[PDB]
Design a binder for this molecule. Sequence first.
Ligand SMILES: Nc1ncnc2c1ncn2[C@@H]1O[C@H](COP(=O)(O)OP(=O)(O)O)[C@@H](O)[C@H]1O
Ligand SMILES: Nc1ncnc2c1ncn2[C@@H]1O[C@H](COP(=O)(O)OP(=O)(O)O)[C@@H](O)[C@H]1O
Ligand SMILES: Nc1ncnc2c1ncn2[C@@H]1O[C@H](COP(=O)(O)OP(=O)(O)O)[C@@H](O)[C@H]1O
Ligand SMILES: Nc1ncnc2c1ncn2[C@@H]1O[C@H](COP(=O)(O)OP(=O)(O)O)[C@@H](O)[C@H]1O
Ligand SMILES: Nc1ncnc2c1ncn2[C@@H]1O[C@H](COP(=O)(O)OP(=O)(O)O)[C@@H](O)[C@H]1O
Ligand SMILES: Nc1ncnc2c1ncn2[C@@H]1O[C@H](COP(=O)(O)OP(=O)(O)O)[C@@H](O)[C@H]1O
Lengths: 252, 252, 252, 252, 252, 252
Amino acid sequence: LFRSLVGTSRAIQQVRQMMQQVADTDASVLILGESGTGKEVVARNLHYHSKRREGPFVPVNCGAIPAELLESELFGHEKGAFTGAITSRAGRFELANGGTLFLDEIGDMPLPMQVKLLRVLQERTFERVGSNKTQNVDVRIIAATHKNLEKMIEDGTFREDLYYRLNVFPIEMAPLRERVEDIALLLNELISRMEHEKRGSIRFNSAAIMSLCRHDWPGNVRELANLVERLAIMHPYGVIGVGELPKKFRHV
Amino acid sequence: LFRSLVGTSRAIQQVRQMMQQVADTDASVLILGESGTGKEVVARNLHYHSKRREGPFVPVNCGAIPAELLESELFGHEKGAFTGAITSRAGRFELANGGTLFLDEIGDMPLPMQVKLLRVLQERTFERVGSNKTQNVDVRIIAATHKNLEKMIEDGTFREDLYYRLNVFPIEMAPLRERVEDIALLLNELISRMEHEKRGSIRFNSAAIMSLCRHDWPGNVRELANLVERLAIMHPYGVIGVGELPKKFRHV
Amino acid sequence: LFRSLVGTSRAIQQVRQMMQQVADTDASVLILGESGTGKEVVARNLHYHSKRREGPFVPVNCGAIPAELLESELFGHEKGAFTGAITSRAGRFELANGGTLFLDEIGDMPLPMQVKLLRVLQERTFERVGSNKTQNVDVRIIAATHKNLEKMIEDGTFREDLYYRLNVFPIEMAPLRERVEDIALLLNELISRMEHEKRGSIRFNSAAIMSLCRHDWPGNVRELANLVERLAIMHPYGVIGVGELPKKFRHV
Amino acid sequence: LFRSLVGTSRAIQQVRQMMQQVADTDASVLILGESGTGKEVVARNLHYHSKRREGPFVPVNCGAIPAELLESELFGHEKGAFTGAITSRAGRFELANGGTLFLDEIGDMPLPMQVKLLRVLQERTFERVGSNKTQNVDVRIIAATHKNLEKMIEDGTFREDLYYRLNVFPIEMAPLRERVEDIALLLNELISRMEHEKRGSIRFNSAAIMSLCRHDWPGNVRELANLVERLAIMHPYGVIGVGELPKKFRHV
Amino acid sequence: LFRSLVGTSRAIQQVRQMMQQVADTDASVLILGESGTGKEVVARNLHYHSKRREGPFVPVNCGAIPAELLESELFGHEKGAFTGAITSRAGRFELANGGTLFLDEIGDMPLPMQVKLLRVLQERTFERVGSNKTQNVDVRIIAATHKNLEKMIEDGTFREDLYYRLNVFPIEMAPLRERVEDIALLLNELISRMEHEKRGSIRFNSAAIMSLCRHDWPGNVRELANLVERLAIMHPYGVIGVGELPKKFRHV
Amino acid sequence: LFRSLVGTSRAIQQVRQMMQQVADTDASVLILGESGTGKEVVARNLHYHSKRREGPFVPVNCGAIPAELLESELFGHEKGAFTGAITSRAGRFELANGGTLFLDEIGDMPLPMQVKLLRVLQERTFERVGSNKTQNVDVRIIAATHKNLEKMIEDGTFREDLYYRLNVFPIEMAPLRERVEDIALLLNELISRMEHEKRGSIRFNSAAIMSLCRHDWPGNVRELANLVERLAIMHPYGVIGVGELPKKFRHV
Ligand SMILES: Nc1ncnc2c1ncn2[C@@H]1O[C@H](COP(=O)(O)OP(=O)(O)O)[C@@H](O)[C@H]1O
Ligand SMILES: Nc1ncnc2c1ncn2[C@@H]1O[C@H](COP(=O)(O)OP(=O)(O)O)[C@@H](O)[C@H]1O
Ligand SMILES: Nc1ncnc2c1ncn2[C@@H]1O[C@H](COP(=O)(O)OP(=O)(O)O)[C@@H](O)[C@H]1O
Ligand SMILES: Nc1ncnc2c1ncn2[C@@H]1O[C@H](COP(=O)(O)OP(=O)(O)O)[C@@H](O)[C@H]1O
Ligand SMILES: Nc1ncnc2c1ncn2[C@@H]1O[C@H](COP(=O)(O)OP(=O)(O)O)[C@@H](O)[C@H]1O
Ligand SMILES: Nc1ncnc2c1ncn2[C@@H]1O[C@H](COP(=O)(O)OP(=O)(O)O)[C@@H](O)[C@H]1O
């Protein structure tokens, strides 16, 4: 259902503490961090330690949904509202009612939908597309982005008013290269997962871990997880020394 | 339905007085001010103290609507008028008939629509897109911007004739850093709202308020409101001293 | 339907006389003047005292129409001619057939359209976009600009041949600061309009009028009209002395 | 059922070894290579040396399926879900259950489907379109592309999280011009196939093979195969010298 | 049943020779040439000099069939498979079994069908739409296009793998303006056809033929044939001099 | 049964002469002209001066028939062939056998039917829908369009091969504004028809006719005919002066 946030670093301890405060509340959470830094972990963790911990956790990827269809995605539609509406559709909001709604990559939401998202977050009502029946929403909002929202406000690509509405309780996730002291602990967690799930086993020697601690991690912890995965295929139940690392991971 | 304009400053008192004069009239109101300075408050307040106080308050965000779709947004469309017009559409004007129409960020309206907006404000008739049936409009106009419209007229990005039509009764909203004497009063209002709505409680000590009075407030009163919100999560029913302020807010 | 040109100045009397000569004819009229100087008044007045006084008065704002769409604007289009042409479109020319076509800010027409406008003004036929069916046009041309067309010819931004075609009967409109002797008469007209239309009433005292006669009037008579409007809100049925003028209007 | 990977080059030997490791596992395989480099060979070979070697090998061409229909393609649909759904439809996943699912040109999958593909690869359940019954999936994933996925992640056209999920065990296929030492061996295989299948026979002389080893091979081994085919029509049971090569293949 | 390829030019002699080689074989033939260059002649000629010369010659115009119906066109369908399937349908493949299948304008086949066409050309089996019964196909493939397939591969509008499958034995048909030395011979053939079929008679004088040899022939030999036809109506049993040519055909 | 082509203009005399040549023949006639230019007159006239002058004149409006039903329209159907085929149906071809078949607005025939129309015009046989019994056709083809077929060939919306088949003997009908010298003669014919049929009488004075000669005639001679009709209602047995013309017809 949820994962815990492994790590010994100051920054990761800050996150844990900030998670305890806000989870129980219904404050809107905005999580800032590079891709793979554990933003969805924090979000799903928040939820199950929240007033809505029995209700629905509803993802919405505001960027991977075609702009023309995002309104129908969020509120739903009845029929005839547009070409192809053969049937009725519940939206994310509907499906999230009584739970948390997770707005994944909020910085990719089109401006038209930013406006409508704000009106709903204010009025707490919405119209399905086509229908003019307004409808009540009960949702705990959690949003995540890796974009600089402040710059986007300046560029006129993100709305100031939405921003201040969503950014009530900001949580910043450090990128992996800024918490390399967490790598060993993260490696252990990632390997237990793999073993618990009967996918395989490995472990890393000290030289390897030193080498990994010097890596960039553009893909951060997800990249880390992928590497564990590849090495378990390549050296099942092996020990990984620096010679078992792929070249781009060696830094001696 | 509406909020009142808290504040003790000379400028905010000017606004109140200017609001009393014009509200009862059907003069077009143009409100100039930075984002978060209470322009929508003034507008919604104006409306409910106006001849249309029973009719519809209809927002239109002239910038957050894609340019190609703004004409359909304002006047409506019938069918077939363009790709996707499966159905009929009432426009903002229609929905605003008998009430006030609020043109949010008028300085982001495309030039084509400035022309058509003026013709309607003059002729007081409009065509739905596609249809050639002209239609009567009864609307009290209220517009708001944070852009320098005079410069835009010079740059050829805003029309002179629209400007003089809309700028009958100009209301200027001071930014927060120019009315810091209002901050305590604003804090009290913002906190009563939060308590009345069972979201929480706080209050600020004198040192904190002095510190806040030295802040820039790029996001003005909306930024202020957001800060109250965060601190209510962080210190429920607490007292905020300068050490409870986020670093960027401390100025001693 | 039309307004008359109030004013006692030599220049405004010249315009009146020049209007009498040309109106009855089908000569092309070019009206030069700063924004708000009454160029559209002269044009609409010309029309209803012309051979086409029963036919359509068709505005076209050559600058407020996106360049890529101006050709479709003028001649019309059939279908398929470009992206989005779901339907048929009559152009301004079509709609102006049997009336006058008013080219507002001709100095903002793109060079491609200057060429096509000239060929039509010569051949007196045109193709809808897409179609290759040529079509007959019966239009009295009236154009207006506040740009120096002669300089634009030099800069290569306005065509010499179009210019000489349109500039058959040039009418120059003096800016307001060059006919301040007309201000009182203009004030009276502007106030009767307001009263006739049940919008309010005011009048100005002599000191106020002296002060107004010393003003720059960047927006000329439209600016004047706007001021009358604001003061009618601020001092309904009042008398305006120089203390009732906005500061930028006081010159004693 | 499957082909073996002929070739003496270092790179092709690497592939063979990497194929032995991963085939027996259920790790996701991503194969990178230009068109015609044998990516489908590697995939079909992998399968029949895998835990699913008795189950279904199910191709899906993520680019040749219209975007609007790809969701129905993968998961299936019940009825009424959209226009034309007269009947029920099993999806690729269903048909691949117990076997391997081969995602041909994964880099052409639309972003909406990347999201849904990832959720299924994680949750290991899916909804047929229309239905809300979730369903279990047992599939070994194999994907292939000739696109630079890393650039696409940067361009925002391919998702980072999908990428790291699919790229557990990357196999890179060298283009033919980088393994020209394999051409003779490839020629022999391609000719035995043709003879075994009673389509004809040829062989190449040394001069011809030298000439072929200097060719670009934009279409790589598939292009090679096509050339063998044409020459068997043109010179049945002949010997191909450089004069029997098409001009663009001669390099002396 | 078939026509022979008249002409004295080098290129037309090449075609004849290439036709002799491939006709007897079951190699796939791809014929490239502008519209009216005799691609269907070459195809029908090929067939009756082929192993399938007693079997069915089955045209399919891959562009003139609506995309949504092309799959049913090729493989057939049973019933219920979609809206309107009241009955059973044999596809082109079925009807072509034991003969040649001619894919006219292959470059207009939608990508979905390119994929399915290739799988059938490989597996040599197919499913009628709806049915899941697979079925054996015995067909000699002949395809024709006037499109640049290589560019289409680049544009991602034609598949590389289909291309290399179909392009085993490429036949290029020169446009008429590149074989004007064939025009007289072509004229004689076209006129004998007309006489043999009791439609009329003409012949051309030398001046006329010189004039025709300087023509563009956008429609090539079909255009030529049409001209013969018109002139036989206009000058029955006449002699055509350059004055009997339509203006666009005169080049002296 | 037929009308004669009144008119004194060069172009109308050309048509008459071209009608004499082709009528007696069985050449396919293509008539190009704007709506209302007398294309059906030419066609019906052609027929009764043709080898089929005793047989059936069979109209088919290729655009006003729903695309899905046009095949059944042309060839007929047996039963069961599709939903609703309770009975047998003869097609236009059948009903036209021994006469002329008039393809009205051929440029609106769907591409699928262009293909089938050509095969029939070549093979001279056809299948009723459903049946597989082929059937002999004896028809003289006459087609008419107001579309640019050459452009449609370019746009891929009309087939090149059909075009060259149908365009054996092209007849172009000038629009009315290009033969205004024919208007008086046309008026006389149109009025005699009306009198002969006891519908009324009028005649036009010289001023009126001059005015009509300056009109656009978008609807050409049909528009002319309609005007005669309206004026006979409005001024029975009257004389029409320019004041009896509708405004849009006055040009002095
Ligand atoms: N602190 C952490 N402790 C344990 N696992 C983590 C941590 N941070 C990230 N992960 C794991 O890393 C991977 C990607 O994290 P994810 O939450 O998807 O990041 P994001 O949403 O920011 O891209 C998942 O496997 C996740 O469980
Ligand atoms: N003078 C004021 N008194 C009370 N509340 C105010 C005042 N000015 C602004 N607010 C509050 O500040 C926030 C933002 O104001 P808003 O009207 O949205 O500004 P704008 O439209 O200019 O961005 C809202 O919470 C609003 O109620
Ligand atoms: N001489 C005049 N007499 C009366 N009204 C005038 C005169 N000149 C201008 N106006 C008024 O001034 C305003 C703007 O004039 P307009 O014709 O729009 O100028 P332009 O087209 O040059 O910008 C309108 O209210 C118009 O009726
Ligand atoms: N190493 C190899 N040994 C034998 N045949 C090969 C090899 N590589 C490719 N082929 C053959 O080349 C052709 C195209 O390969 P394919 O697997 O379709 O490549 P891709 O899927 O990358 O386009 C097929 O005929 C295939 O059997
Ligand atoms: N070399 C040739 N000899 C005789 N007739 C030819 C020749 N090439 C084309 N034709 C004739 O030209 C016309 C059109 O040719 P067609 O095969 O339909 O070309 P395509 O299929 O390339 O459009 C037909 O009348 C055909 O018989
Ligand atoms: N040259 C002509 N002489 C007499 N009548 C004509 C002539 N041309 C057109 N008409 C008449 O004009 C009307 C419309 O012509 P029609 O043949 O229907 O044109 P189309 O088929 O091109 O639309 C009919 O009343 C027809 O009889």
